[PDB]
Design a protein around this ligand. Sequence first.
Ligand SMILES: Cc1c(-c2cccc3ncccc23)ccc2nc[nH]c(=O)c12
Length: 298
Amino acid sequence: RTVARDITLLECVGKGRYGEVWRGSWQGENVAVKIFSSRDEKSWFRETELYNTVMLRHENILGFIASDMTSRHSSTQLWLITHYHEMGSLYDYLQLTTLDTVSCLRIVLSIASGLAHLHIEIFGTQGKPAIAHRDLKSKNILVKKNGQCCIADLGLAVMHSQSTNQLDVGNNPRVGTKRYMAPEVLDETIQVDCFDSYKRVDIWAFGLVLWEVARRMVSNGIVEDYKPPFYDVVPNDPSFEDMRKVVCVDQQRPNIPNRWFSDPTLTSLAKLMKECWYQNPSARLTALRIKKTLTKID
Ligand SMILES: Cc1c(-c2cccc3ncccc23)ccc2nc[nH]c(=O)c12
């Protein structure tokens, strides 16, 4: 029922090498429309597969509405239509407000719950395969009205089924965001035919998002300004070589502000954080473990 022809493009809320994101009106209601760039057409195919064939659906995953193609301007555009969240991306949201303890934990737990849903296979007839995201970042997370978040952008998803032991890495020349790239990626030791490798890459990236969020939690009247990971050692649009020097050569990691050690929540989150950042990919916590821990912290 929801098709591109019937959506009114109202406002452009995002632009990048992926294409554009629009706020659209469909029967009055707001919808989110990602119009893919020509260079990113493979990500549209992958997302269309996950949302339509795998039927991905979870309260902490961006709500899919429909895939469509529309011919306009003597070209054919690939659309991905999703729910629209007034609060926007976690990246923009953190820059416009600070958090108390409850709101900080609600955010990071909701992301953990979203990531656990992806990583965990559901067995049986029409079961869902295990899925690794591979481009988790604050710009690929949206904030819902109930204070929870949801994960978006499945263009690089990798899937695995324990039964057949089938690994499906797709076929996409797209490379994850360099700022959030794990060390085993930057120095090319990652084992590309092992599904656990891609999950561990998600955990590294998650750790960085948890750092971005915690910085905005107020404790004892103190709070850090929003900053992206490695803001102090790499420039904007950091190069591959820039990231390997910081993450691999100098074995650097996001700094923990000393004021975090005066707050029990931030101290536990600091520990959680770092346990996502091991150079040794197999030492990192699993998504389910993160979710469990976040459920107990208060
Ligand atoms: C859903 C969304 C995206 C978005 C992010 C990542 C992947 C997406 N993929 C498809 C459609 C939108 C996507 C980007 C900006 C937004 N700004 C206000 N409200 C929104 O909901 C919103």
